[PDB]
């Protein structure tokens, strides 16, 4: 049996009909589904354990759940210290704050950031808000002949005035996946800092930060089987130790008086105000649920699933594929592509009669589309409950579309 | 049959045993317990609907999401849903207006009015605009009844004032501030003013055009809401006229290599992914809250402040902080300390007889040390509890006096 076999039963919203059809959810690069665990422990915190992070019992067993979460993270990712992890309401948040603690304190006009032509706009707006009040300047990335990652280009845009490397680990419409260690590198030796935005990589695949050695790192739960409303900044100790406070509040204070306030130690520092108590816990959940099956295991699987759904793909005449070919090597298990003389918006419409659920549009990255003029572009993205035989519902179903446009 | 009566079988949460005893729920200023209407609507999105806010599941979820806009709109009696803002919680709603407004109009030498009594989420974001602008901050103080002294803050307007943030109802001393005239006095004089509505919002109607206040804030999880989820209030042609904050996806109308455009409001402030579950849940707490009529939650309220309060002051031993119930109206709260005894062995000891209570300077350390206070202990009430439970509390405070006596 399949992994996904295996664990669909533990996702009750994939068990319903869209449109007189199963639902075949293919838009998981957008936001995943959560399995029973995940809920489960949401439910039980709020139905017996919720009060705030105290001397009496309920305090005491919210308290407990809760602070268990940050090591769980610390591990997923291999942070050296759980000191290292900051709760954010999503990976934008986390981006935002980077840019305004660090970025906006750092980066002095002439200041070079190399982000490249495939970001999405929450790992773009930021540094161009950070630009716009700094004087820095942003340089970017081009793509190669694989759609991918331009690593040679990359170092042509290296200097004495380079102070900050942002990238996608993963592109969420590309599906490439960009040389993050390899990048850092090159960054430190050119004396800069390196964030990398790993919303696409965490969920699917085994992160390592010491490995990439990047300076910070962020991520969303809502894609990796938690609920939205808490996402995660990954930063070096040193790093944060040195940046300066962001929200000002309760809980992030060590003591407070009229005239001034001192900050309380990492990673209270970031977190003001009461947290996303439950959401928390919850992805604690996520991640517990997610090692279990192994995220190598995960990315085996989608591997698999990903050969199968671009060799279907491929035999479709009218249609062009973006971002590198799963035959040159790992990449995203998703597809973002068009069919010619169609629109993506009406193969969508179109595929979603059939209970299948896809995604139109630029998917927040409306500079790469532009850049290659492409109106949008049609993705199907897949997670380890997808199927085989899901993939194959959906090549018809696009097949049928085109012949209805023809 | 109390209002509590008719509705605790709604909070699964409240029926459970702590340390043999049954629960006793007396920490409502710290966070809210849920009915079922709430989590079963959380509970119902992530099992039928869960998707981003153009397929089926995407169009049920972005239906229920956007829905949520107006309960909340309606609930404060806000002109516009334009002019709601999710946030995770009242805190991140008052830094993104210190950050949007505070740091780009207040100049050195601009005051900012505030109290003595406000929490640190309405103080430190402050202090922070503060430390870069050069603004200044002015306190009002106490009067005689430990509550707003009007008189006083009337004396610390001037020409300089830019800014007046003041708490509605205070956490710690319960008070009710007169948000209505601090507005209009402030706005004569010629200065924006915020209202901290977090101990307000879950148990006292709110009217922003009453009020008029420029901004309020208030946090979901203090009134039967999910954590995670919060919001502010802004008049919409302030907040057209605030620069974004977080920027990224969502936020945006266009984005160029080299530039930008904004969304319209709200959405101009709320960048990435939103806690749409989250806000989802929060509408059906507004829907709950309404069904059962903040007015008649009010009422209920005092009704429990003044059988507390006549509890509390008829034990000789207690020092109690903030207006008595019968000075004026006042919170469903009270902050006090047992004379030679530290307010955690309190809770700690209140909590053996299954009675939960908070020790601590409730995120309220400046007006603590007025006090000459480390922290107090403080009772805190809700719709659902009873006159049953601040008895077994007053028994449970008086038998601890006994054993530290
Ligand atoms: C959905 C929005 C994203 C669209 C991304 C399209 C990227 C693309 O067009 O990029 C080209 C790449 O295809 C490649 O171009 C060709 C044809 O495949 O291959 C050679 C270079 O080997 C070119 O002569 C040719 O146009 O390479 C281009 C240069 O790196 C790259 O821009
Ligand atoms: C509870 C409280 C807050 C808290 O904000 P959170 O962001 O929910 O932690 C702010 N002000 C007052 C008056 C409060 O009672
Ligand atoms: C989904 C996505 C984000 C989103 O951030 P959110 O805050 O969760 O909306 C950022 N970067 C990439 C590469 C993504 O795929």
């Given at each position: 049996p399949s992994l996904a076999?295996?664990?669909?039963?533990?996702?009750?919203?994939?068990?319903?009909?869209?449109?007189?059809?199963?639902?075949?959810?293919?838009?998981?690069?957008?936001?995943?589904?959560?399995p029973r665990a995940?809920?489960?422990?949401?439910?039980?915190?709020?139905?017996?354990?919720?009060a705030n992070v105290g001397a009496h019992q309920l305090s005491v067993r919210a308290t407990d759940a809760y602070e268990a979460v940050r090591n769980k993270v610390a591990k997923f990712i291999n942070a050296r210290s759980p000191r290292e992890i900051v709760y954010?309401?999503?990976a934008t948040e986390a981006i935002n704050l980077v840019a305004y603690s660090w970025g906006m304190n750092n980066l002095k006009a002439g200041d070079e950031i190399i982000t490249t032509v495939m970001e999405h706009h929450s790992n773009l707006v930021p540094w161009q808000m950070v630009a716009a009040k700094t004087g820095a300047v942003l340089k970017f990335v081009q793509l190669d002949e694989q759609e991918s990652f331009d690593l040679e280009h990359f170092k042509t845009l290296l200097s004495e005035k380079t102070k900050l490397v942002t990238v996608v680990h993963i592109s969420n419409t590309l599906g490439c996946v960009n040389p993050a260690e390899e990048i850092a590198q090159l960054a430190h030796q050119a004396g800069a800092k390196v964030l990398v935005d790993a919303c696409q990589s965490a969920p699917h695949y085994p992160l390592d930060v010491q490995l990439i050695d990047c300076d910070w790192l962020v991520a969303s739960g809502h894609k990796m089987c938690a609920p939205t409303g808490i996402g995660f900044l990954y930063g070096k100790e040193e790093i944060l130790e040195a940046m300066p406070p962001f929200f000002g509040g309760g809980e992030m204070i060590a003591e407070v008086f009229f005239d001034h306030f001192t900050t309380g130690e990492l990673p209270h520092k970031f977190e003001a105000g009461t947290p996303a108590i439950a959401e928390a816990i919850a992805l604690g959940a996520a991640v517990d649920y997610l090692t279990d099956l192994g995220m190598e295991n995960i990315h085996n699987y989608e591997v698999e699933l990903t050969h199968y759904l671009w060799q279907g793909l491929g035999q479709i005449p009218q249609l062009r594929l973006y971002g590198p070919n799963p035959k040159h090597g790992d990449?995203?298990?998703?597809?973002?592509?068009?069919?010619?003389?169609?629109?993506?918006?009406?193969?969508?419409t179109m595929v979603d009669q059939d209970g299948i659920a896809i995604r139109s549009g630029h998917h927040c990255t409306q500079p790469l589309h532009r850049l290659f003029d492409a109106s949008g572009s049609a993705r199907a993205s897949l997670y380890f409950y997808n199927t085989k035989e899901e993939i194959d519902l959906f090549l018809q179903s696009l097949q049928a579309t085109i012949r209805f446009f023809s």
């Open positions: 076999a295996t664990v669909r039963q533990d996702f009750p919203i994939l068990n319903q009909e869209i449109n007189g059809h199963p639902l075949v959810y293919l838009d998981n690069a957008a936001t995943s589904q959560k995940v809920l489960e422990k949401l439910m039980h915190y709020y139905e017996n354990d919720n954010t309401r999503n990449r995203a298990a998703l597809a973002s592509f068009n069919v010619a003389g169609l629109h993506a918006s009406d193969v969508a």
